[PDB]
Ligand binder design. Structure first.
Ligand SMILES: OC[C@H]1O[C@@H](O[C@H]2[C@H](O)[C@@H](O)[C@H](O)O[C@@H]2CO)[C@H](O)[C@@H](O)[C@@H]1O
Length: 322
């Protein structure tokens, strides 16, 4: 009954399979052969819109005894800035609805092994985003995360990883980050986390990320939070990033294939995980000025949509190579 669910065989899902299939059909020869090998590489399934509560059962039926990795990404506000919406809940109580629904479905599957990653980019924003008129959403996000952990944090067939940004974002604020994490966990009832996920939807090298894990791990320890393990998103971190551009970064490459316990010199690290879907657009180029940076790839479809050209770039730039 090992507490590292990645030591089990990992579940490859029909959605990513279908996404790679679209690319396979537009490719020939060498790159097609490569794409065919990427198709069965386990990737996390994102719960990122209100309908996603209906998606959970299918995943769980098709997975059998294989580890399923879910990314809960359905919090109410994503930016405490003007003109932002379309992915989050009306409010806390709408959110608690989604959490209960997912929690309930999960309960019907006592033999499944489920990894739940709490919302990506929430802690990051709580530490670094400004506090003048964003006081309200701030406090609600903290409640949101505490609630999610209070539910999923008690299910035996679940292992929770709270997301905590990446080194490029929070390494110089490990003390404040631990402060926020420690308060959330204080309001999370009897919910326990297995650890922290980093580098979700980002390109940071495993080397620097593990350095971030160490500093953050220490901050949490000096706060009373002990025994934290880590997972790192290796989906797009094969090549060091040219800049801090987060949106559809040019020159990125598929990183290490998902694996449990990948390095005995990294004893804090549970696994390399493909958490962001390699090939899915970060955002439409039109959507955010940052998507128009010199080192963001252009012609990006909307967030979540297959971006064929990007996938190809990722394939070519893969590290370790084929
Ligand atoms: O990591 C993906 C995440 O990036 C967010 O921008 C971050 C950026 O990743 C980080 O390098 C920099 O230090 O901070 C900014 C935020 O100020 C982006 O806002 C998210 O949409 C994205 O998921």
């Amino acid at each position: 009954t090992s507490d590292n669910f990645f030591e089990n065989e990992l579940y490859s899902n029909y959605k990513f399979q279908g996404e790679v299939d679209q690319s396979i059909q537009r490719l020939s020869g060498s790159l097609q052969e490569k794409a065919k090998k990427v198709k069965y590489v386990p990737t996390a399934a994102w719960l990122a819109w209100s309908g996603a509560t209906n998606e959970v059962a299918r995943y769980l039926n098709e997975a059998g005894s294989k580890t399923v990795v879910f990314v809960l990404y359905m919090i109410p506000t994503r930016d405490c800035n003007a003109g932002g919406s379309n992915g989050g809940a009306d409010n806390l109580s709408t959110y608690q609805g989604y959490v209960n629904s997912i929690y309930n479905t999960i309960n019907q599957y006592p033999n499944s092994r489920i990894v739940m990653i709490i919302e990506p980019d929430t802690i990051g924003n709580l530490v670094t985003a400004n506090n003048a008129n964003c006081r309200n959403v701030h406090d609600m996000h903290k409640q949101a995360l505490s609630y999610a952990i209070s539910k999923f944090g008690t299910q035996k067939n679940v292992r929770v990883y709270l997301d905590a940004a990446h080194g490029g974002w929070l390494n110089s604020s490990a003390d404040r980050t631990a402060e926020v994490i420690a308060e959330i966990l204080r309001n999370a009832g009897n919910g326990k986390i297995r650890g922290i996920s980093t580098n979700v939807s980002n390109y940071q090298p495993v080397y620097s990320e593990y350095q971030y894990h160490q500093n953050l791990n220490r901050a949490l320890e000096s706060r009373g939070v002990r025994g934290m393990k880590f997972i790192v998103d290796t989906s797009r971190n094969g090549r060091n990033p040219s800049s801090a551009t987060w949106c559809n970064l040019k020159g990125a490459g598929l990183g290490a294939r998902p694996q449990a316990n990948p390095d005995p010199n990294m004893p804090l690290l549970d696994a390399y995980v493909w958490i962001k879907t390699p090939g899915e657009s970060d955002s439409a180029s039109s959507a955010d000025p940052v998507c128009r940076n010199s080192d963001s790839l252009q012609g990006a479809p909307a967030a979540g949509s297959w971006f064929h050209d990007y996938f190809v770039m990722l394939l070519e730039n893969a590290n370790p190579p084929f």
